[PDB]
Symmetry: C2
Subunit: 309 residues, 2 copies
């Protein structure tokens, strides 16, 4: 069965476009997919079908400024003021759309990229439905967020022109070093996947519209959520539930595996239950990379079944 869900965003502007997918028979879990920057939930058709095949309910929305939400509002790469709280609030609202349908079932959040940051921030909030946390394309200690992005210049832009397009200089700082292991023929979004076919399709997909100029307030939202996901308060408040991590060793977002190993090691030192899948030689979208997609999906099913046990 298919449900179309719409609700007003926390930003009061966007009709959030959302879908629930129910398998045949009696489902054993709910998986909530949280897409990343400059993409959309219906890009996950393969994964959704694999999870339905496993007996899970899947629920996903196109965030503020993204996908069909952007296509219907006409607003791309902006989510309103307090953009981090908007997209966190809307992912909570999404859970409430199934209230009284699957209340007895375990609930896993799978977040990719910006989605890994939204999933991490969500996790730390009381009231969130969360029995297991799965993170993919994990943004963790990249040079751009950690050091290159100039908080003083951003703060001046936030004070004077929050809703205007983000200055190019600031945007470049956020992506600093993302092309450090690419060739010229990989193109500037070569970091998305080793597979040129995956990258080509990413750049064609009208529901991605990747590279729509972001607003200054949307860039502040990325810097806010980064600090919410990688900050001391994340580690201090992460609940004692199973966690699984999927990343490419060749992904700049996770500082070429170094950032992702540090997340795993800090969670482990703090006594957490952590499963790490670090794909050697693969780039950001290990769930879309033809070498790793089957392994990510089968590990994700195994993980949801373990949460359920």
């Amino acid at each position: 069965a298919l449900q179309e869900i719409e609700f007003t965003s926390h930003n009061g502007r966007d009709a959030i476009q959302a879908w629930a997918y129910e398998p045949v028979g009696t489902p054993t879990a709910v998986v909530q997919i949280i897409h990343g920057l400059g993409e959309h939930s219906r890009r996950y058709l393969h994964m959704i079908s694999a999870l339905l095949d496993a007996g899970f309910v899947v629920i996903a929305d196109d965030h503020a400024g993204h996908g069909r939400t952007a296509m219907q509002s006409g607003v791309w790469a902006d989510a309103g003021d307090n953009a981090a709280e908007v997209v966190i609030s809307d992912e909570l609202t999404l859970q409430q759309q199934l209230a009284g349908q699957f209340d007895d079932l375990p609930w896993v959040v799978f977040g990719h990229s910006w989605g890994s940051m939204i999933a991490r921030a969500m996790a730390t909030r009381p009231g969130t439905r969360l029995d297991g946390l799965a993170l993919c394309g994990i943004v963790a200690q990249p040079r751009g967020f950690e050091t290159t992005l100039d908080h003083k210049t951003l703060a001046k832009a936030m004070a004077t022109a929050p809703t205007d397009p983000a200055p190019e200089a600031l945007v470049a700082q956020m992506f600093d070093g993302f092309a450090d292991r690419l060739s010229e023929d990989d193109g500037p979004t070569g970091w998305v996947a080793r597979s040129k076919e995956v990258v080509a399709d990413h750049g064609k997909d009208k529901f991605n519209n990747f590279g729509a100029p972001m607003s200054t307030r949307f860039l502040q939202g990325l810097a806010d959520i980064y600090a919410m996901a990688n900050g001391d308060s994340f580690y201090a408040t992460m609940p004692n539930i199973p966690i699984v991590l999927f990343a490419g060793s060749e992904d700049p977002a996770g500082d070429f595996g170094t950032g992702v190993k540090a997340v795993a090691e800090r969670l482990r030192r703090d006594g957490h239950n952590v499963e790490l899948h670090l794909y050697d030689g693969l780039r950001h979208e290990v769930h879309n990379e033809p070498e790793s997609r089957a392994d990510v999906e089968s590990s994700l099913v195994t993980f949801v079944d373990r949460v359920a046990n």
Copy 2:
């Protein structure tokens, strides 16, 4: 990649809701899915994903009176006047929504149930894109359309009240014998699948809304497309292309296997290239039956690859 496509129906009322699904890499074929009565195209997620895995573009719409088209228009189980011509015209117009994008690729039509009848009706038309024809849940020789449905009573209803709800007697006659191999607990839609799970999901899915009252003119479109799909012109004009048939032996729509055998036999007699998959013990939706889904999909992929190879 994903495209949302909408066009005005041939009926001049409905915004046909449609989608194109593009695989990563260079596609090798296009597959048009044509859904059946009281269902919708997004029900085919498993199949679409499998065809994408195989390097095929997939294109599908919710027909007039169906799925998201009905949800947006508020009109369920009616496709306007000349309903058979409307749903055929709308499938040809769907093809043209990709004009210039995939002009070099072979095009396969996959049609389930009512869609098997739409697909067959399309194949007889000059300028249809059709490099291979795949039929599922085939409607052929069931007693209801063949004998029980009273065309004098249908003509009276169309003369006097074509937009009224179809008289319950004509609807009963059209479906006569569909529960001949069902128990009371299988319920009236038990013919859909052996799997009680599949039938329950079919009932629950809000984009099916199976059982909304059809209009009289819509019922006339089903009688009309039955004749277009199964009449002598179908066999006499069938293109020199590969054909694959998938049906369950316990599917009343094919006269419990007997009608599907009649279709394959007549095409073979005339020298056509026919592949028959008749699944013992299974009912109508062999693409959704857990026992046969993998076989229907893997057979369809190999079939499309053969069409492209040719």
